Amino acid sequence: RNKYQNARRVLNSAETQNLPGRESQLQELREFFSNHLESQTSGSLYVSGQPGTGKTACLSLLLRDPDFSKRLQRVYINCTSIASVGAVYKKLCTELQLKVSGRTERDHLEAIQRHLKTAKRMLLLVLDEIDQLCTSRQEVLYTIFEWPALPGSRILLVGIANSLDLTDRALMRLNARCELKPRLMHFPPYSKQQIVEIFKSRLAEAEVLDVFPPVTLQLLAAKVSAISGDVRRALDIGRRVVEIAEQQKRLKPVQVTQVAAVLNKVYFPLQQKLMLCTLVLMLRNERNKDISMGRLHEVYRRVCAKRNILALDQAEFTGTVDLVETRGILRIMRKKEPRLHKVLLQWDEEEVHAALSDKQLIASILSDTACL
C-alpha cells in the first residue's frame, strides 16, 4: 500500500537482476568465460568470500546471459542438495540427461567422462557451496577438479565457497600441476559506499527513495560495513527499520534515532541470581577456575543458609544452572556424572553485575568470603 510497505517489500533480500556493487567482478568473470570460449580450452575457477557478499548473485546473473546461452551449456548444482558427497555425479547426470546403465556411482562417473570426451558444446559447471564436498580422502573433489585436465574435455567449472584457503588447504595436490590448479577470485566484503549504492538502487527501483534520508543510510552502512560487510544484514536492518516504524507510527522519513535504536539493540529468578553471585564469588576468590557443579552447589547452600532463605536440592540446582546456560552467561562442559559437570563463565563480571541489576545483593554475596 503506502511507501512503508513498498520499501519493506522492495528491500526484499531475494534474487535480483541489477548488481551495482559487483561490476569489476562481473567484468572479470565475463572475461574469463569469454577468453576460455574463444580459446576453446578448459579452465577451472574458484570463487570465494564471506557470506552475503554476492557470489551466487553474480553467477546466477551470468548463467542467464543470452550469449552464453548460445555458446555454452550452463549447469548449476547446489552441493548441499545432494544426498551424499559421492552422489553428486548422479545429480550431474540428471542435469545433462545422460543415459547411464545405472545404480552405481562408478558408472555415473564413466558416463560423465564419456560425455566430456565428445561434448559438442562447452560446459559451465557451477558447484555452489563446494565446502560440503570436502571429506577426508576427498576422492570426489579431486575427481571433479581433474576434469579440466582430462584429454579433450571442454568443461570449465566454477566452485563457490566461503573459505579463502579451501583450495590450497583442501587441495594441496593440485598445486603440483599448474594446468590443474583453479584460478582464484575473492569477493571482498562490501564497503560503506557500496552498501549505500545498493540501498539507493533498491529504493529507486520502486521510487521509495524519500523514506530514507542519506544521513541515516550513511549511519546504517557505516555500522554494517564496519561489523561484517554482508548485504543481507544491511537489507535486514533496512527492512526492520521500516517494519518497526510502521508498528510505531501506527510521509515521515525515518530519523537517525530509529536506526540508532535498532542498531544499538542488534549490535532474573532469585535462585539464578544466587547461583550467578556464588559463581562470581568463587571465580574471584580462587585462582583455580575448574568449578564443578557440586563444588558450586556446596557454596551456594552455605550462601542460602546465611541469607536465611531455602536452598534448592542438587537435582533442581542442575536445572537452574541449565536455564542460566541458555542465556549465554555460562557454558557447561559435560562429564560422566551430573556432579562432575564443569561450569565455565562466559561473561565478564562487569557485565554480570549490570545484568543482575541487584547491587545491594551482589555487594553482600561478594563480601561473604567466610561462606566459601
Binding site: 573459505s163 579463502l164 603440483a176 564496519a226 561489523i227 585462582r287 565455565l344
Partner: protein, 290 residues
C-alpha cells in the same frame, strides 16, 4: 656395504648417459618376460625414479595382457581399493568382502577357475605411503603367490625389507634387478606426503573490526615481547570492536582457521593468544599498518 657401528655410538653429458642407461634397461625386457614366465616376480631397487621404466614395460611388452597398474606413491590409496579393483573390474565379481584376506581368498578361488588368464600387476613403490603397514604387504604377498598373477614392483626406501619376514619373502618370489636410473623423483614426491606475505594476504580480506582485533593482539605482542583473553575482551569492549564475548570467540576461531593466532590454554583456565611470528617481522607489519 658393511657399515661401522661407531657412527651410531658416537652420535649435457648426463642426458646421453641416462639415455644409454635407459636403453640398456629397455634391452633387459625379454629376460624379464621369461623370468616372469618361470614364476619369479620382478623387483627393481635402483637410485632414481623407475616410473618411466615400468611404464615402458607396460607399453612395449604388455600391450595386450591384462594389467593392473598400482601407484604406490599415492597418499590416499587403500588395499581395499586395489582388491575392489581386481574383484570388480578383472573378474566382474562385484565388491570385494570387507575383510581383505577374505577378498584374497575369493581372488584365489576365481583365479583358480581361469587358467591362461594371467593378470600382470605393476606396483610402482611397493614401499608406498599407505603400503608400509605389515597387513598390506601380507595381502600383496598372498596375491603374488598365485600362479596366474605376476608382479613387477619398485623399491625406494632404505628400510623396506624390515616388514618382509621369511614367509612374505617366500611368497614374494622376487628376482632382484638393479635398475639404477638417475632420473629425479618428480612424480613420487609431487604428492602431499612430501609467513608475513600470507598474513598480509589474509589480513587484506578481513573487515575493519577484525583488523582492529588483530592490531590489538599485535600491539600487545610487540609491547610485551601471548595475551590473556580477558585483556583482549576488555580492550575490544572499550574500542567498540565487538558486541559481546561470543562474537570475539568467533573472530578468534576465524583467526585459528587462518592460522594468524595460536591459542594456548593455561592451567588457570585463561586462554593465551600467541602470534607465531618473530617480533622483527611483526614490528615491520605494525609499521606496514601505519
Amino acid at each position: 656395504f658393511v657399515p661401522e657401528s661407531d657412527g651410531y655410538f658416537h652420535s649435457a653429458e648426463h642426458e646421453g648417459s641416462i639415455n644409454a642407461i635407459m636403453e640398456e634397461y629397455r634391452s633387459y625386457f625379454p629376460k624379464w618376460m621369461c623370468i616372469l614366465n618361470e614364476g619369479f616376480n620382478i623387483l627393481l631397487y635402483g637410485l632414481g625414479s623407475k616410473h618411466q621404466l615400468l611404464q615402458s614395460f607396460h607399453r612395449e611388452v604388455l600391450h595386450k595382457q591384462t594389467v593392473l597398474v598400482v601407484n604406490g606413491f599415492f597418499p590416499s590409496l587403500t588395499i581395499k581399493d586395489m582388491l575392489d579393483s581386481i574383484t570388480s573390474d578383472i573378474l566382474d565379481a562385484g565388491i570385494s568382502p570387507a575383510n581383505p584376506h577374505e577378498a584374497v581368498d575369493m581372488i584365489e578361488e576365481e583365479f583358480a577357475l581361469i587358467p591362461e588368464t594371467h593378470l600382470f600387476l605393476i606396483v610402482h613403490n611397493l614401499d608406498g605411503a599407505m603400503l608400509r603397514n605389515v597387513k598390506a604387504q601380507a595381502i600383496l604377498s598372498r596375491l603374488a603367490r598365485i600362479p596366474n598373477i605376476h608382479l613387477l614392483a619398485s623399491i625406494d626406501h632404505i628400510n623396506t625389507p624390515l616388514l618382509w619376514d621369511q614367509g612374505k619373502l617366500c611368497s614374494f618370489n622376487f628376482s632382484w634387478w638393479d635398475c639404477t636410473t638417475m632420473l629425479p623423483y618428480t612424480n613420487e614426491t609431487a604428492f602431499e606426503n612430501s609467513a608475513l606475505s600470507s598474513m598480509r594476504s589474509v589480513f587484506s580480506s578481513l573487515t575493519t573490526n577484525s583488523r582492529g582485533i588483530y592490531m590489538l593482539i599485535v600491539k600487545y605482542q610487540l609491547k610485551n615481547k601471548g595475551m590473556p583473553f580477558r585483556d583482549l575482551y576488555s580492550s575490544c569492549r572499550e574500542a567498540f570492536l565487538v558486541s559481546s564475548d561470543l562474537a570475539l570467540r568467533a573472530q578468534l576461531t576465524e583467526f585459528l582457521d587462518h592460522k594468524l593466532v595460536k591459542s594456548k590454554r593455561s592451567v588457570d583456565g585463561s586462554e593465551q593468544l600467541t602470534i607465531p611470528i618473530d617480533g622483527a617481522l611483526l614490528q615491520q607489519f605494525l609499521e606496514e599498518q601505519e
